Structure 1
Amino acid sequence: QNLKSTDRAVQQMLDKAKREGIQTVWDRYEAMKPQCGFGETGLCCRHCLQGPCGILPFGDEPKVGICGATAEVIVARGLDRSIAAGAAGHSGHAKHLAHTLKKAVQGKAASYMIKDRTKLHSIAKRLGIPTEGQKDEDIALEVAKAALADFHEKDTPVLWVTTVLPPSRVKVLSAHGLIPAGIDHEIAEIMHRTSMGCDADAQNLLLGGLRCSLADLAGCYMGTDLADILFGTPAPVVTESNLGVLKADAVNVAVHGHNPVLSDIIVSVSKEMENEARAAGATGINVVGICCTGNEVLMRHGIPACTHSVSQEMAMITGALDAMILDYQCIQPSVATIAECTGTTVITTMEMSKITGATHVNFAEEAAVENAKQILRLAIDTFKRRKGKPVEIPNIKTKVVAGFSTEAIINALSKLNANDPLKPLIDNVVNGNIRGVCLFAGCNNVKVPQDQNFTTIARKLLKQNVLVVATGCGAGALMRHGFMDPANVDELCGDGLKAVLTAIGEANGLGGPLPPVLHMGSCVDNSRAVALVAALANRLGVDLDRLPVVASAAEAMHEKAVAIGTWAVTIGLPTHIGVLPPITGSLPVTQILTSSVKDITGGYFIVELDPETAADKLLAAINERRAGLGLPW
């Protein structure tokens, strides 16, 4: 049972679900085995009606597609479409945020406003939008219009690419034609070139995929920018994680998905419906988070992290989850069925993301408070239906210190050097106190036992003084196993890393160290790491592919994770992926994505499914980057 998840509460709820005959994601995975060898090697194509075409990894015919598409062509086309799908997800997230900001500053959504004036000003200056002597709503409208225009061809390339990376990096990517012209333009061109009879050259397809991954990076950066403008830039905050944050005597409302435009309003309206909740016979409206919108409200408001990714269903298995408010992106549709057994009202709110069997509430920024009142009223009804009945909420919760936006990190460092905030960090990088930086990102994969790779690699990296930051469900796993709790620094961190964390934390008025891992936010907030990594780059006069910075999609599952890893490579990072991507069916594509892209961008993928070996490989990558700079290791 410990082979399905390393989270103890998840094991408890798996026992409960097995008890009651509630089918789980691990059960469905067990029904799916043996899985198909063509697809999970990437050697399968259904790109037209002459298919499906499978190419045996080794042996006799079939060796080539019916139309003549080779193994590498098929592999590259599939990977390109994965990158495009992830880019579409992130880009639509940011597109909805841009629409919300425009509507707010045009007077069409009064529940939304400019909550971070300073970030709006700095973004407008970064884009060349004039701020001085201009109405705040005027420059916000201009910023939203620039964001919307970055989705198509225009006078300029994608500004959320070209103005967020150092100019030398932009030059390197422009010398290879990797700079995107428009986000949706790149997505459509990927869909065009990978369809039948089009592009059939592996190197060409992989370069196009790098461009599409940069479009995804632009989408992530824009989403972070607009969410910070509308809802505020996160600052350090203390909260709790895992299922134990649920309360049998409260109205449990879990916000699940990626777009915060809805759940941020939920967090506010719930406090106003506190009295209504009391009238129902409840202590209050206990709002918890699931997946990335949960991480957004965790970073901005200290909302507890109920659960993440592959184990989302386990929340409903408590029996005390009265509402699950879904927007889109990584909701298992199984919840809609599982609700029937758990007395959970599952509520979709977005037009392009509905699930069969769930109540739908058509969200609109013009009626966000109205929608939220209706939804939480349904949640109150659901609580009323279960008064006095038995629930099993595992009494398991960790302490989580989060809210480490790049702005907050720079400020906390400025406590040690007011005029050159990055200098203390670079100093400790030089003297060995900080070996390097690792970004943990991505989701949980049902094939990898939950949180095993993240915790294992994190332990091996922290004991060697790697400054570890995390986002999304990587942050979720590490926070559910105690890595955002400073009380574990002594157990987890090496001496130099402990000293650096202690120095910053004691300079930041909390008497103790920073938590062993810095939670940088959601899946799109990976852009935050870019913002940090580029900044240090600018401070050191070098390109990212010269920094001892690595990334780890240790348990990657989603197409967005593939796009994120691809643009982590593209901006120049060594990027470990801890699950097998569908590239092993063609040695040329694997060699390009792990070896020869070093000649193109300086980054490269590291495919390794053993977390001990993967941690050693990440350590070696960090140490080679250190050596290239002339640093001991």
Structure 2
Amino acid sequence: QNLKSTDRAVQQMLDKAKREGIQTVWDRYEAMKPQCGFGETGLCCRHCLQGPCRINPFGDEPKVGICGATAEVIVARGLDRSIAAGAAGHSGHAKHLAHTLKKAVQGKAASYMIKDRTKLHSIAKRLGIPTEGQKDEDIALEVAKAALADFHEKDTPVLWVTTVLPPSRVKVLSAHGLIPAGIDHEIAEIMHRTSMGCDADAQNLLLGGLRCSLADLAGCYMGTDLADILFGTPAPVVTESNLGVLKADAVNVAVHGHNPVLSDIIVSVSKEMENEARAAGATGINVVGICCTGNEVLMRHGIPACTHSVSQEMAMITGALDAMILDYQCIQPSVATIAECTGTTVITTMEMSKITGATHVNFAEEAAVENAKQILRLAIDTFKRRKGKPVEIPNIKTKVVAGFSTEAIINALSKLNANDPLKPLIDNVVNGNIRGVCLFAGCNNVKVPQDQNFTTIARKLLKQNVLVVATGCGAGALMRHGFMDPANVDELCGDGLKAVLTAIGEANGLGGPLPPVLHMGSCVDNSRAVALVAALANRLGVDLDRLPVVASAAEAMHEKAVAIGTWAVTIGLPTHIGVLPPITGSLPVTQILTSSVKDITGGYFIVELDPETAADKLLAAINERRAGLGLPW
């Protein structure tokens, strides 16, 4: 099972699933081999009913699409549609939060409120919205309106791009026509330009892609902004991760998907229903997180993370998962069928994300508490149905210190320098105690032994004094392997990095260092990393493409991860991807994405499937940036 996952809890559940004849994602992957090489290389097109078209990567015919689309057009069009799809996910998420905020402050959803007034005001200020003499509810109404306005064309570009990157960066992007006009506008334009008989120039197509990726960034940043207003900006919190956070004697409820609009209420209402759960013979309701929505409630409330991404089915295989509460994105639809075998009640809540065989309980913000109770009562009934049934929860969990929003990081650093909080970080970059910064982001992928790339790359970078920050299932991987436990600093960290983590932790009263890796939250919270890096850029008076900062989507899967990688490149970062995106069928496209794009944005993709080699390449990219700033490396 170590060939499937490096997570021992997952390995244990894989053995149980095998024993019980429950098919997993790894089994479905094995059944899919060998996968289509046309798809793998990007040399397939189904954009019209004359298709499917394919192009042999090498050899003889077919060499070109039926309409005349070249390999470079077909590859660039496919990529662009993946970026649009990612943008559409993050922007649906952000939009849901925008309408929730609007409803809350209009008196239409009393379960929701302005929890972070400081965040609300700072956002308003960043957007140009007056706060002076204004009611919080009116400021928030204006913020929600601005959010919604960024989805379409108007007299300004997307503010959740132009107001979050340094002017120098906006200027570079504007010069290349890369600033999004509207989030959904860009999504639609991509779908248009990539449809048959439209855009058929690789560079032009890819430039569209870059612009659409910035629409994704806007959605991410908007989602983080709005979730923070509604649910609070994360601060450092201690919790646990992995399957051992499940409790046989509790009603175990997984929140799974992405939107804190749902999970945050589940968390609060679950505490209110403890006695009712105890009436049913449980100790209480044990809310645990899967995927980003788990990350959301982990960051804000210290809700323990059960598992992530590719291993999500394994939580069910324990036999102790009474409910899995879903909104949207990254939910393997296998869960609905597996539920039948495991007893788990899988519940969908969003009109646009149903799964055949799951129970659907409409969630309306207007009735959030009511709907939460209905959902949690299904979970209690399910707990009761497994009275006397043996469960196998691997007794495996790690300690996780998380909640490192950018505000939290700045606050942490401020204990070393109150009025110039970024300076201590920069001082240590300059003196070599911090070599650079690496953001690990994105998914696991069934193609890569689970977590192997994240942990292999993270280990190499940490020994080389790289400050490692993480989001999404990258944070998931690292937390589950102990990288968020400060007790592991001595083992994992180079002396310089240890020195810095220790200095900061001790100034924050911890008697010990910050953790080896800083958990910056969910996938939309990649925007937090952007805020940090942009703040550093602003503090240094240079653009992001001069900073020793890189990203690694080490085990990428979702279209959202492709969108995030692409905007990481677009804002000026060397961006590693540890799985093959469908681009190798076109050398010119590959060359643009991995080389010539440097001349446009300063960022670039580093496609590297071998994690040791990926780590060297990321270190090289970091060190090149250091040299560019005149620093030793």
TM (normalized to structure 2)? 1.00
Deviation at 1:625, TM superposition (A): 0.2
| Deviation string, structure 1 residues 176-222 (Cα, Å, up to 9, x no partner) | 00000000000000000000000000000000000000000000000
Write the distance in 1 (CA, Å) between the matches of 2:418 and 2:612.
39
- Stretches (4+) displaced over 2 A: none
Write the distance in 1 (CA, Å) between the matches of 2:148 and 2:559.
23
1:338 matched to which residue of 2? 338
Write the distance in 1 (CA, Å) between the matches of 2:359 and 2:565.
35
Deviation at 1:389, TM superposition (A): 1.3
1:566 is paired with a residue whose SS is helix
1:564 matched to which residue of 2? 564
Deviation at 1:337, TM superposition (A): 0.1
Write the distance in 2 (CA, Å) between the matches of 1:388 and 1:39.
48
| Deviation string, structure 1 residues 475-511 (Cα, Å, up to 9, x no partner) | 0000000000000000000000000000000000110
Write the distance in 1 (CA, Å) between the matches of 2:606 and 2:620.
11
| Deviation string, structure 1 residues 440-466 (Cα, Å, up to 9, x no partner) | 000000000000000000000000000
Deviation at 1:147, TM superposition (A): 0.3
Deviation at 1:240, TM superposition (A): 0.3
Write the distance in 2 (CA, Å) between the matches of 1:20 and 1:419.
60
Structure 1 residue ranges without an equivalent (≥5): none
Deviation at 1:430, TM superposition (A): 0.1
Write the distance in 2 (CA, Å) between the matches of 1:127 and 1:455.
38
1:218 is paired with a residue whose SS is helix
Deviation at 1:333, TM superposition (A): 0.4
2:56 is paired with a residue whose SS is coil
Deviation at 1:433, TM superposition (A): 0.2
Deviation at 1:388, TM superposition (A): 1.7
Deviation at 1:559, TM superposition (A): 0.3
Write the distance in 1 (CA, Å) between the matches of 2:400 and 2:367.
33
Is 1:162 aligned to residue 147 of structure 2? Answer: no
The percentage of counterpart residues that share the same residue type is 100
2:173 is paired with a residue whose SS is helix
1:255 is paired with a residue whose SS is strand
Write the distance in 1 (CA, Å) between the matches of 2:509 and 2:405.
18
Deviation at 1:16, TM superposition (A): 0.2
Deviation at 1:317, TM superposition (A): 0.2
1:627 matched to which residue of 2? 627
1:77 matched to which residue of 2? 77
| Deviation string, structure 1 residues 249-280 (Cα, Å, up to 9, x no partner) | 00000000001101100001011100001100
Deviation at 1:584, TM superposition (A): 0.1
Write the distance in 2 (CA, Å) between the matches of 1:24 and 1:109.
39
Write the distance in 2 (CA, Å) between the matches of 1:363 and 1:242.
28
1:595 is paired with a residue whose SS is helix
Write the distance in 1 (CA, Å) between the matches of 2:529 and 2:282.
41
Write the distance in 2 (CA, Å) between the matches of 1:544 and 1:246.
42
Write the distance in 2 (CA, Å) between the matches of 1:597 and 1:262.
39
Deviation at 1:392, TM superposition (A): 0.4
| Deviation string, structure 1 residues 38-65 (Cα, Å, up to 9, x no partner) | 0010000000000000100000000000
Write the distance in 1 (CA, Å) between the matches of 2:248 and 2:599.
57
Deviation at 1:384, TM superposition (A): 0.5
Write the distance in 1 (CA, Å) between the matches of 2:288 and 2:560.
24
TM (normalized to structure 1)? 1.00
User: For residues 37-76 of structure 1, what are the structure 2 equivalents within 5 Å?
Assistant: 37-76=37-76
| Deviation string, structure 1 residues 370-403 (Cα, Å, up to 9, x no partner) | 0000011010000000112100000000000000
Write the distance in 2 (CA, Å) between the matches of 1:316 and 1:478.
22
Deviation at 1:73, TM superposition (A): 0.2
2:469 is paired with a residue whose SS is strand
1:109 is paired with a residue whose SS is coil
| Deviation string, structure 1 residues 594-633 (Cα, Å, up to 9, x no partner) | 0100100000000010000000000000000000000001
Write the distance in 2 (CA, Å) between the matches of 1:482 and 1:203.
42
Write the distance in 2 (CA, Å) between the matches of 1:153 and 1:372.
36
Deviation at 1:581, TM superposition (A): 0.5
Write the distance in 2 (CA, Å) between the matches of 1:359 and 1:289.
19
1:606 is paired with a residue whose SS is strand
Write the distance in 1 (CA, Å) between the matches of 2:48 and 2:30.
30
1:235 is paired with a residue whose SS is coil
2:321 is paired with a residue whose SS is coil
Write the distance in 1 (CA, Å) between the matches of 2:193 and 2:478.
39
User: For residues 506-545 of structure 1, what are the structure 2 equivalents within 5 Å?
Assistant: 506-545=506-545
Write the distance in 2 (CA, Å) between the matches of 1:281 and 1:105.
39
1:504 is paired with a residue whose SS is helix
Write the distance in 1 (CA, Å) between the matches of 2:247 and 2:178.
50
Write the distance in 1 (CA, Å) between the matches of 2:315 and 2:181.
42
| Deviation string, structure 1 residues 85-137 (Cα, Å, up to 9, x no partner) | 00000000000000000000001000000000000000000011000000000
2:552 is paired with a residue whose SS is strand
1:306 matched to which residue of 2? 306
| Deviation string, structure 1 residues 286-340 (Cα, Å, up to 9, x no partner) | 0000000000000000000000000000000000000000000000000000000
2:601 is paired with a residue whose SS is coil
Deviation at 1:35, TM superposition (A): 0.2
1:490 matched to which residue of 2? 490
1:520 is paired with a residue whose SS is strand
1:188 matched to which residue of 2? 188
Write the distance in 1 (CA, Å) between the matches of 2:411 and 2:267.
27
Is 1:278 aligned to residue 283 of structure 2? Answer: no
Write the distance in 2 (CA, Å) between the matches of 1:9 and 1:223.
32
Deviation at 1:248, TM superposition (A): 0.5
Write the distance in 1 (CA, Å) between the matches of 2:270 and 2:594.
49
| Deviation string, structure 1 residues 218-242 (Cα, Å, up to 9, x no partner) | 0000000000000000000000000
1:394 is paired with a residue whose SS is coil
Deviation at 1:550, TM superposition (A): 0.1
1:210 matched to which residue of 2? 210
Write the distance in 2 (CA, Å) between the matches of 1:357 and 1:92.
24
Write the distance in 2 (CA, Å) between the matches of 1:386 and 1:505.
44
Write the distance in 2 (CA, Å) between the matches of 1:573 and 1:158.
21
2:603 matched to which residue of 1? 603
Write the distance in 2 (CA, Å) between the matches of 1:419 and 1:386.
56
| Deviation string, structure 1 residues 417-455 (Cα, Å, up to 9, x no partner) | 000000000000000000000000000000000000000
Deviation at 1:579, TM superposition (A): 0.2
Write the distance in 2 (CA, Å) between the matches of 1:76 and 1:130.
42
Deviation at 1:360, TM superposition (A): 0.3
Write the distance in 2 (CA, Å) between the matches of 1:281 and 1:65.
63
Write the distance in 1 (CA, Å) between the matches of 2:271 and 2:632.
54
| Deviation string, structure 1 residues 561-589 (Cα, Å, up to 9, x no partner) | 00000000000000000000100000000
| Deviation string, structure 1 residues 15-43 (Cα, Å, up to 9, x no partner) | 00000000000000000000000001000
2:511 is paired with a residue whose SS is coil
1:110 matched to which residue of 2? 110
Write the distance in 1 (CA, Å) between the matches of 2:320 and 2:245.
11
1:464 matched to which residue of 2? 464
Write the distance in 2 (CA, Å) between the matches of 1:558 and 1:376.
29
Write the distance in 1 (CA, Å) between the matches of 2:271 and 2:203.
55
Write the distance in 2 (CA, Å) between the matches of 1:535 and 1:173.
18
Deviation at 1:414, TM superposition (A): 0.2
Is 1:324 aligned to residue 324 of structure 2? Answer: yes
User: For residues 59-458 of structure 1, what are the structure 2 equivalents within 5 Å?
Assistant: 59-458=59-458
Count of equivalent residues = 633
Write the distance in 1 (CA, Å) between the matches of 2:94 and 2:135.
23
2:597 is paired with a residue whose SS is helix
Write the distance in 1 (CA, Å) between the matches of 2:2 and 2:374.
40
Deviation at 1:415, TM superposition (A): 0.3
Deviation at 1:70, TM superposition (A): 0.2
